[PDB]
RNA sequence: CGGUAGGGGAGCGUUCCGUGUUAGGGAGAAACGCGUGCGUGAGCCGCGUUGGACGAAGCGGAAGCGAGAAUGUCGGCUUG
RNA sequence: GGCCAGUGAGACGAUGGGGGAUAAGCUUCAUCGUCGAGAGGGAAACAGCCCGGAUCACCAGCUAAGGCCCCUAAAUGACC
RNA sequence: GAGUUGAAAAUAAGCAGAGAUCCGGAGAUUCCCGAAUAGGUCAACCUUUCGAACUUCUGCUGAAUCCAUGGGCAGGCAAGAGACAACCUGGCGAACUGAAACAUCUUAGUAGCCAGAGGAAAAGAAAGCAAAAGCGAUUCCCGUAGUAGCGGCGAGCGAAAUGGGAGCAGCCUAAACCGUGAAAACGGGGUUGUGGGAGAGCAAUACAAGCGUCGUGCUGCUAGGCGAAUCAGUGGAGUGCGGAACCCUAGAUGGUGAAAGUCCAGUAGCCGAAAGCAUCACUAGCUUAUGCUCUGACCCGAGUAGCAUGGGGCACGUGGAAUCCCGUGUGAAUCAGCAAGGACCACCUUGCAAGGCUAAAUACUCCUGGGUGACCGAUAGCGAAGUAGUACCGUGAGGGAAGGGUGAAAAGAACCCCCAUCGGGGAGUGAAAUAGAACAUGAAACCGUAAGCUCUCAAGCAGUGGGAGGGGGACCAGACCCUGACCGCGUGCCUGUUGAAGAAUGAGCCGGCGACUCAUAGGCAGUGGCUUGGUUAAGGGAACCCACCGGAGCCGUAGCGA
């Protein structure tokens, strides 16, 4: 390939249409904006969502519930991982399953929250190959799948909350068998 | 990135050269040179369709005036009566041309339309 | 540079549902409820799709929420 | 296979840039003016007892990119 | 359905009506035709009436509406 | 190292191969006005006892008043005043606008005005974030993120924490205690945080580092120096073209009659500073200084924090309203404490306010020195390519133009004629005089002159179709161009209306300038690159772009519910 003979494929770069350059070009005269109104005048024009003096679409509808109250919205607290992410993976019979394994394998790519939401293994899909999972807690159906596969299942306690000594005393008093 | 040009003067000089013999400011003055180019071309349109129509009219009245020289009441309509009954497919009113370029031959035309 | 701002007065009213369609809460519920019917008060208690006109109006007025069509 | 508001497809031109210290050019380039030529047309090509040093095409890109209108505007020159 | 426009001042003519004074090229509706956005021919001229839907050329022919004394193409045609 | 007394020629005299002109470092003068400063002033002047006036510092004398204060006198190379485009800080601080009105809000703590100050300024060394895991001053960039929120929950406004980079630097002071003095001070000590310091007692000596007129050191800058390699023919001129050779550590650039590696100035490279400035490295020298045990007493910044109110600002508009700073008024505790962790209480965690100072990353151009430009080419680019903020206008604030290009070299026309000049024609220069000083290419409107055809019984958006008659060159002589007897037909163009030849709008004409553009995002379409999912931002880079890093983040992988 020389510097001469290079050319783009057709359809790759259309020409930008220029407006007000002749009526044979297509958008001459009023440049494709009719005759008058706010659509033809120059400026910000119309707010998108404005109904022309009518009370708008969004104001006539009541607010969504926790967003109406200002309550903090529903937020994912784990990484949802099915067993379909585990069978299609190249994990063989002897292999650990943890955070850095699923990151370094190419299943999860967590960036915005590396610190808060650990992991969770869910139920849909099967898992025939046995493994040794030391990750965070499970669903009941995924516990039925993993204990149905005969694999080493280990839940990992992540963090310990601070309990006040009178609350820890009142809870330790409740050990009445 | 200034873009002063010359293409309006060739664009305009072609239209300037077409507008010769327009008698005054229709042949010199640009802002009328344009609309005389325009009106001259549509004049060419309607005078072309009506030169078809107009030469049709001219040959009709010319062969009518040729046939009416017999004196006896033989019109132009009767020449077409006995011009299509005696099977002469479509002489196309060019007998109005050889009616003056060959008047004895159009006398042979009409004198064989009679028989 | 200048990021587009999410319109908050419609972000509190509209919502995406996984497949990618705008849903909304029906109107006429927090006012004069004895006057209505229980049939009306559970007809007006559910969240429905918004119709295509105002499904294509506010789709450009609320840019960062991943709605197809 | 008429077409206004309007929508889509395909192209011409301009100045600069890559090829480019390109081909060509004081044995006359650009300009300006010319055509019994070619195109659907925007335009191309050719000719000049004018002018005197630059600058094509092709394949590509980027625009202060195309004028007849704005009681537009700036110079020149009319009318009365 | 996706992207993406305009338009939201209409006008006359026939029918169905209301307002009027069954007055207006008046006003408002309902179905339709034209103009808008439609050239050509007939209408003397003349958006909306009739024929009619213009890709282009021909110094081609046949027709619709309408006409055949002259201006101006075609019958000073025939018979009541 | 060879000619000079600016542009800028001429004339008169000089100055100069015991080194001129010029360049560079350091000095000298600098009338008058202007901070303007001896006093006045109507700026560039007047009067003068010739004076840095005033404020500050120092010294003497020292009023009402004893000490004081004020004043006066004097000294002083004498510190400040004034100016500065933009950035920065502090204070006053809008309104048009957006909300399709408008008052809450926004525009906006922006513009403007004043003050100050530096090449940067502000901030800055945790009474901090965070959450039971951890970080370690401030600033800036990418990101989280247009998220959490705030808001007539309208218009809009919009963080922060985790993470990744640039740059890193920490130090002085008060109090408790000793000593001198009537306090007020001074000199030692101590300045820290899963606490220190003071008091009492025991040990113990030198490793390392910080600061710096002074001068030897280094490179760099402000003058410069050497510096490679060709002729000949061509229509004015050769650098272009054609023929013969060479340089390259040099083919960047500008000029030379014309375009240059070999003509010049230069460049690559090698060199070079008496003098000043700057860069880090020496130096006489000043400094920082150590560990343990006991001791809840003594201390750890008071009209301060907090509280009742009135508020401001943190994205947070008074809301549950925390943190931060102020107005009035009340008004604490010292470490067994106090403050913060978004009202508040209890526990834990974190830090030690009411005392100050600090470079870097960072923002900008009245500029300066280099290098560039899909930047302009005299209506452009700075308003300004000449007198440019000029002429001119305004009392003033202020507004504000226009005019470039003869040649290569003036070689700028000796002389003759017209003639009072201006001008013109010969001649002469030049390649060009139709390049003549109004001077380079010179288009259109506009004004003309010459040649061909044609108009004075004619109604016409000036055309067009047919074409009488006539004229011109011609070679495919039937063709082409010009004129137009007469006939048919034809309601200027745009805007904008239901409808415009319209007696609706617009334009005297000609030529230029003159309008969906740019930044960043969302969405969709078309073409790609990978699908072992994709892709980097900031930032680093042979000056920029760039190879290659840089996985922070983003998007898709799981949804439902408040």
UniProtKB/Swiss-Prot annotation, chain A:
Region feature (Disordered): 1-41
Presence of the UniProt keyword Membrane in the record: no
Basic residues compositional bias, start-end: 12-22
An individual GO BP term: translation
Keyword flag Cytoplasm: no
Annotated GO CC locations: chloroplast; cytosolic large ribosomal subunit
Protein family membership: Belongs to the universal ribosomal protein uL15 family.
Protein name listed in UniProt: Large ribosomal subunit protein uL15c
Swiss-Prot record, chain B:
Superkingdom of origin organism: Eukaryota
Source organism of the structure: Spinacia oleracea
Keyword annotations of the record: Chloroplast, Plastid, Ribonucleoprotein, Ribosomal protein, RNA-binding, rRNA-binding
GO cellular component terms listed in the entry, alphabetical order: chloroplast; ribonucleoprotein complex; ribosome
Primary location recorded for the protein, binned into one broad class: plastid
Gene3D superfamilies linked to this entry: 6.10.160.10, Ribosomal protein L20
Any Gene Ontology biological process: ribosomal large subunit assembly
Subunit structure: Component of the chloroplast large ribosomal subunit (LSU). Mature 70S chloroplast ribosomes of higher plants consist of a small (30S) and a large (50S) subunit. The 30S small subunit contains 1 molecule of ribosomal RNA (16S rRNA) and 24 different proteins. The 50S large subunit contains 3 rRNA molecules (23S, 5S and 4.5S rRNA) and 33 different proteins.
Signal peptide: none
Protein name: Large ribosomal subunit protein bL20c
Pfam families documented for this protein: Ribosomal_L20
Family recorded in the similarity comment: Belongs to the bacterial ribosomal protein bL20 family.
Location of this chain's protein in the cell: Plastid, Chloroplast
Gene Ontology molecular function: rRNA binding; structural constituent of ribosome
Role, per record: Component of the chloroplast ribosome (chloro-ribosome), a dedicated translation machinery responsible for the synthesis of chloroplast genome-encoded proteins, including proteins of the transcription and translation machinery and components of the photosynthetic apparatus.
From Swiss-Prot, chain C:
Subcellular localization: Plastid, Chloroplast
Subunit-level organization: Component of the chloroplast large ribosomal subunit (LSU). Mature 70S chloroplast ribosomes of higher plants consist of a small (30S) and a large (50S) subunit. The 30S small subunit contains 1 molecule of ribosomal RNA (16S rRNA) and 24 different proteins. The 50S large subunit contains 3 rRNA molecules (23S, 5S and 4.5S rRNA) and 33 different proteins.
Function summary: Component of the chloroplast ribosome (chloro-ribosome), a dedicated translation machinery responsible for the synthesis of chloroplast genome-encoded proteins, including proteins of the transcription and translation machinery and components of the photosynthetic apparatus.
Family indicated by similarity: Belongs to the bacterial ribosomal protein bL35 family.
Name listed for the protein in its UniProt record: Large ribosomal subunit protein bL35c
Span of the entire protein shown here: 89 to 157 of 159
């Amino acid at each position: 390939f020389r510097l001469d003979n290079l050319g783009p494929q057709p359809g790759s770069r259309k020409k930008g249409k220029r407006k007000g350059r002749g009526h044979a070009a297509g958008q001459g005269g009023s440049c494709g904006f009719g005759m008058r109104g706010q659509k033809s005048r120059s400026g910000p024009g119309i707010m998108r969502g404005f109904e022309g003096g009518q009370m708008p679409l969004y104001r006539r509808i009541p607010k969504l519930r926790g967003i109406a109250g200002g309550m903090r919205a529903g937020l994912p607290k784990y990484v949802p991982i099915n067993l379909r992410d585990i069978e299609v993976a190249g994990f063989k019979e002897g292999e650990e399953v943890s955070l850095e394994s699923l990151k370094a394998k190419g299943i999860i790519n967590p960036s915005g929250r590396e610190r808060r939401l650990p992991l969770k293994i869910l139920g849909e899909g099967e898992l025939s190959t046995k493994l040794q999972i030391k990750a965070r807690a499970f669903s009941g159906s995924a516990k039925e799948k993993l204990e149905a596969a005969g694999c080493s299942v280990t839940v990992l306690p992540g963090r310990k909350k601070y309990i006040k000594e009178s609350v820890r005393k009142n809870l330790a008093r409740a050990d009445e068998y | 990135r200034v873009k002063r040009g010359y293409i309006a003067r060739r664009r305009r000089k072609k239209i300037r050269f077409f507008a010769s013999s327009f008698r005054g400011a229709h042949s010199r003055l640009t802002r009328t040179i344009a609309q005389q180019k325009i009106r001259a071309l549509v004049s060419a349109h309607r005078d072309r369709d009506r030169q078809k129509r107009d030469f049709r009219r001219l040959w009709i009245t010319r062969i009518n005036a040729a046939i009416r020289e017999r004196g006896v009441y033989y019109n132009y309509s009767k020449f077409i009566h006995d011009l299509y009954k005696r099977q002469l497919l479509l002489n196309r009113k060019i007998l109005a041309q050889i009616a003056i370029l060959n008047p004895n031959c159009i006398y042979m035309i009409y004198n064989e339309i009679i028989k | 540079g200048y990021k587009m701002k999410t319109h908050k007065a419609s972000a509190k009213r509209f919502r995406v549902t996984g497949k990618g369609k705008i849903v909304r809460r029906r109107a006429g519920k927090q006012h004069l409820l004895a006057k209505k019917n229980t049939k009306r008060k559970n007809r007006l208690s559910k969240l429905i799709q918004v119709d295509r006109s105002d499904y294509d109006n506010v789709i450009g007025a609320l840019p960062y929420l991943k709605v197809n069509r």
